[PDB]
Symmetry: C3
Subunit: 206 residues, 3 copies
């Protein structure tokens, strides 16, 4: 079998698409990448990740971002039966439409999940086992381990404390701000540096 | 290696069993299905799922149900050392005994887990990253993302709010009811429709 | 591809290392084990687990311990750019340094994760979907399903209630004690017995 493959023909997908992966990205052999996916340069996709763009599409992962072990990306249907685009399930980023948009320099840590409709802004850390669904996470944010954002917009530069499940815009508006002395303030740039280097190192083993 | 395989011989499993999978089910090549498992028609098993019936057995997945990416099904021992059935670890559904019973038209969403002893009634949605263990989830229920049911019975037609961990029968008795205007009221039938079509589409690629 | 493999050359890893696995351990073909890892005797590594010692290293798993389906072990960098050991990210156990140390007779249940720097004492159960990061879990402990220990030390013989996220030493100091009548008091020794037997049974299929 191939772990990088096209999505299947369905009522909402007349024409199958294969992933477009930059030559500098590393897809582990035990990761799965299916369908209408764009993977940017220097991205590291770890073992057991599953990026599956067969329902809601497309799923984009920007440059120097990392999709860690066991992370799932998938999305709610973006085209219904009759060929109609379901706009509630589509996010818009820089004038383009996506089912899931992961920006540049974003870390999706181990066992986290981003389910479309969703967008994750540049230089944000999505912590271990965290969860994002029907939400827009701004740039320079931090979702600590086991936090979750569902149905909300997380303003730029804010963090979600470990274990907190954010389901209302009123709650997302009062999240705390990332400051220089906040414990995860430098976490994402370290992770990004590491993962870019791991992608290169692992590419030299293939 | 084969990803669909028999369980190993152990003190509690004198005779190995191989999965019984309907020809219309789709098992992704990167899913794992081991042992005394029954998979029904039109079921979709996604990448990185692990259905492992080697301890507690059998594990059943009914018709038109879906086991999404990274979902784990496994169960506590159902036969002890001396060949004795441990009745506390066995669930009974329609006069038959199972370690894990997943009914028909049930969605086990991405990264959720159902650990036996457990039963999940027809047309219920088990949300992303949710958890069911030592529990009986009725039919037409909804476990929102990151909810959990442990050691309880979830009455038919109720939902568990995102992030809520239900560990007592008193709590399960007062869960809210699914109504037409509840946000996840039509989620499972949409997921089921989609996953049945994905199973067929993916079967046409094999 | 090989699922058991060396870590890549990076700025912090001049010399690649391959896993040292006891002949009596069983590594499922759909598990991934990468880099500077030591796996002890009679250990069972299940489908979809990912043990990845490519950043923080080494990762040790002691005798008769089990790494269940979808469990991730990984760790923060232990050597920085300039070849300097980052002592805050290194744990010390019996006079030896590790990125992640999993002791003997420890169960890492399905979908849990232990992220270095971290140590987990002998005969402790890390429950389904639980999370340990920047913490030291003592021996004879129980992390119930969906519990978490972050940045703390969990004293020997204590348990963390299902769903509880422990982030402060004040909180970890007041956790409840495991007693004979506590519900998970015999869980780990049962799991260990089972998993040792599964490792042997599965080794007889290879
Ligand atoms: Zn989905
Ligand atoms: Zn289990
Ligand atoms: Zn990591």
């Amino acid at each position: 079998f191939s772990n990088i493959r096209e999505n299947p023909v369905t009522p909402w997908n007349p024409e199958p698409s294969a992933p477009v992966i930059d030559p500098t990205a590393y897809i582990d052999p035990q990761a799965s990448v299916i369908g209408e996916v764009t993977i940017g340069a220097n991205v590291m996709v770890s073992p057991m990740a599953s990026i599956r763009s067969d329902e809601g599409m497309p799923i984009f992962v920007g440059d120097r971002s990392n999709v860690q072990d066991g992370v799932v990306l998938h999305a709610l249907e973006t085209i219904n039966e009759e060929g109609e685009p379901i706009e509630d399930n589509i996010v818009e980023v820089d004038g383009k439409e996506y089912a899931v948009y992961i920006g540049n320099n974003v870390s999706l840590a181990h066992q986290s999940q981003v389910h479309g409709p969703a967008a994750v802004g540049d230089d944000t850390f999505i912590g271990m086992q965290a969860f994002v669904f029907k939400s827009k996470v701004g740039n320079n944010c931090v979702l600590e381990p086991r936090s979750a954002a569902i149905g909300v917009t997380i303003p730029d530069g804010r963090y979600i404390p470990a274990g907190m499940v954010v389901t209302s815009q009123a709650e997302a508006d009062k999240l705390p701000e990332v400051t220089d002395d906040y414990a995860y303030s430098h976490t994402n740039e370290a992770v990004v540096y590491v993962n870019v280097h791991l992608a290169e190192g692992y590419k030299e083993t293939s």
